[PDB]
Design a protein around this ligand. Structure first.
Ligand SMILES: [Br-]
Ligand SMILES: [Br-]
Ligand SMILES: [Br-]
Ligand SMILES: [Br-]
Ligand SMILES: [Br-]
Ligand SMILES: [Br-]
Ligand SMILES: [Br-]
Ligand SMILES: [Br-]
Ligand SMILES: [Br-]
Lengths: 176, 177
């Protein structure tokens, strides 16, 4: 018996710094997703990792989750696992921060969503947001990683760098 | 013409509402949130958030609220689905643990002390009590389970079972697994 439980992956002392917490998160995601390619499973645990990591970082986040490119027709993002309050069910590519990340295949960092044309708010209290797209081997958008913050300008290049790595791990470990 | 509401508002209500009001409001929110699509991931993800916040406001110290769904490839195995809480076990075999037994017996399991539960599979070592409600198909088979963990012993009772079994039926009719 290791003495550990799955839940233990989300322990981060206030004494750890940001680089460490995020490094541990990637490693935990790797350990937890090694066993199955089931994307719901891996993304669900992934959302918890992200949520808890950010709560430990003292970034006041209110949502941490994923939308996945709908299996049906013309690219639409459909709500996937998340930690946080009830969210919008579907987003068309090109619409809002998530839809913009999906059409551009690029990371979006929004310092104030009320000054962002076309913003699609799922939580009225969200002030800033970061969206990182999950790209497949053939370079198509598979879904996005989306984090909201209750304060303006909550995210920067460090979050983008970490999230982009996590998106790579996700594509290599999940089957959509 | 903005309604002035946001999706998140389904989980924004006073904790001064009594339990029957809160649970009845949850069933109504799930219905309105799931009307537009049969996608089960979307529907169970918002569901997990509804359940989590309802119990937080009822002042039950829960640590997990979520779902497991029967693996398509194998109808005797549960695969981790959407949830609110800490990282959890990825797969559970029918007949094993509280979740696996709710699935094999097709009966709600209300557990006051998880460590007195033979074969308990702890995803969170701090879980002390738990309730698992199986989601049943028209065909009468287990589609998955609704799973809630609590940090204190004796956190659940049959009113929870009654409302969660209604929710499970709404999930079956609203989702395509
Ligand atoms: Br849209
Ligand atoms: Br504007
Ligand atoms: Br694409
Ligand atoms: Br990759
Ligand atoms: Br209210
Ligand atoms: Br009651
Ligand atoms: Br098992
Ligand atoms: Br009681
Ligand atoms: Br009902």
């Amino acid at each position: 018996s290791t003495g550990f439980h799955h839940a233990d992956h989300v322990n981060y002392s206030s004494n750890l710094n940001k680089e460490e917490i995020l490094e541990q998160l990637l490693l935990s995601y790797e350990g937890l997703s090694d066993g199955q390619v089931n994307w719901v499973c891996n993304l669900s645990n992934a959302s918890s990792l992200i949520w808890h990591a950010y709560k430990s970082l003292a970034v006041d986040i209110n949502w941490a989750g994923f939308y996945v490119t709908q299996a049906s027709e013309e690219n639409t993002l459909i709500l996937g696992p998340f930690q946080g309050k009830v969210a919008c069910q579907m987003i068309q590519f090109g619409k809002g921060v998530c839809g913009t990340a999906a059409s551009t295949k690029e990371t979006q960092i929004v310092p104030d969503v009320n000054k962002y044309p076309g913003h699609i708010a799922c939580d009225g209290e969200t002030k800033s947001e970061i969206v990182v797209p999950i790209i497949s081997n053939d370079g198509k958008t598979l879904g996005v990683i989306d984090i909201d913050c209750l304060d303006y300008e909550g995210f920067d290049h460090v979050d983008k760098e970490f999230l982009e790595k996590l998106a790579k791990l996700i594509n290599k470990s999940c089957v959509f």
